[PDB]
């Protein structure tokens, strides 16, 4: 099985892990407190510290809030060359001077940041998206990483919508707040 990583152990990380397992992946979780977090996951999931989880995969969902991104900054060297999927949402339209994905890309300039899956609710990862709204909006400045995440979305039974460069991340983040 291909291994996919998830950082964090909350509602989104748990829902994502369900969907990844159902669609044939092996999941490794990076948690601040993996002994405690291990009960939030089945035994088939490898729950460990961030620095161990990153050695087991090249594709990592960053299932934490923007305000906690800097808690990962000491991992920068270990994260070089890895794909980081920015799934985050904000409470306000155009909340910060940069989109969350551009902010993550600035923290990890030698990682490959891809925006995606922020429009999918935790409940939709468990049940599946509504048939008229299977779309997941994906973008990145790295074409190869963008295509890898597009293929992952297809394997998770979503319809990937390729919006090109990471400049698209701002309005992808505004979309849940717009109607
Ligand atoms: N909930 C949802 O339905 C959706 C959420 N999202 C996005 O997914 C991400 C997570 O959302 P959700 O799961 O709801 O958020 P949570 O509030 O559940 O936080 C998730 C994880 O963040 C980690 N965390 C908390 N504080 C820190 C810290 N100081 N340093 C490092 N890691 C920390 C914890 O993991 P640990 O304690 O294991 O380290 C926690 O389990 C957010 O960006 C959110 O916008 C996107 C779409 C839907």
UniProtKB/Swiss-Prot annotation:
Gene giving rise to this polypeptide: STEAP2
Family: Belongs to the STEAP family.
Tissue-level expression: Expressed at high levels in prostate and at significantly lower levels in heart, brain, kidney, pancreas, and ovary.
Entry binding sites for FAD: 123, 131
Coiled-coil regions, chain positions: none
Keywords assigned by UniProt, alphabetized: Cell membrane, Copper, Electron transport, Endosome, FAD, Flavoprotein, Heme, Ion transport, Iron, Iron transport, Membrane, Metal-binding, NAD, NADP, Oxidoreductase, Phosphoprotein, Transmembrane, Transmembrane helix, Transport
Binding site for NADP(+): 9-12, 31-32, 64-71, 89, 122
GO BP, sorted A to Z: copper ion import; copper ion import across plasma membrane; endocytosis; Golgi to plasma membrane transport; iron ion import across plasma membrane; regulated exocytosis; response to hormone
Function: Integral membrane protein that functions as a NADPH-dependent ferric-chelate reductase, using NADPH from one side of the membrane to reduce a Fe(3+) chelate that is bound on the other side of the membrane. Mediates sequential transmembrane electron transfer from NADPH to FAD and onto heme, and finally to the Fe(3+) chelate. Can also reduce Cu(2+) to Cu(1+).
GO cellular component, one term: cytosol
Any GO MF annotation of the entry: cupric reductase (NADH) activity
UniProt organism field: Homo sapiens
Annotated compartments: Endosome membrane; Cell membrane
The protein's name: Metalloreductase STEAP2
């Amino acid at each position: 099985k291909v291994t996919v990583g998830v950082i964090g152990s909350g509602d989104f990380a748990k829902s994502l892990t369900i969907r990844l397992i159902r669609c044939g992946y092996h999941v490794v979780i990076g948690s601040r407190n993996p002994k405690s977090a291990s009960e939030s996951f089945p035994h088939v999931v490898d729950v460990t510290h961030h620095e161990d989880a990153l050695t087991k995969t090249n594709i990592i969902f960053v299932a934490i809030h923007r305000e906690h991104y800097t808690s990962l900054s000491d991992l920068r060297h270990l994260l070089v060359g890895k794909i980081l999927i920015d799934v985050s949402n904000n409470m306000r339209i155009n909340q910060y001077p940069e989109s969350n994905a551009e902010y993550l890309a600035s923290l990890f300039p030698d990682s490959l940041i891809v925006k995606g899956f922020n429009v999918v609710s935790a409940w939709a990862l468990q049940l599946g998206p509504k048939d008229a709204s299977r779309q997941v909006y994906i973008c990145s400045n790295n074409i190869q990483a963008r295509q890898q995440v597009i293929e992952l979305a297809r394997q998770l039974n979503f319809i990937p919508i390729d919006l090109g460069s990471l400049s698209s991340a701002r309005e992808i983040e505004n979309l849940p707040l717009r109607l």
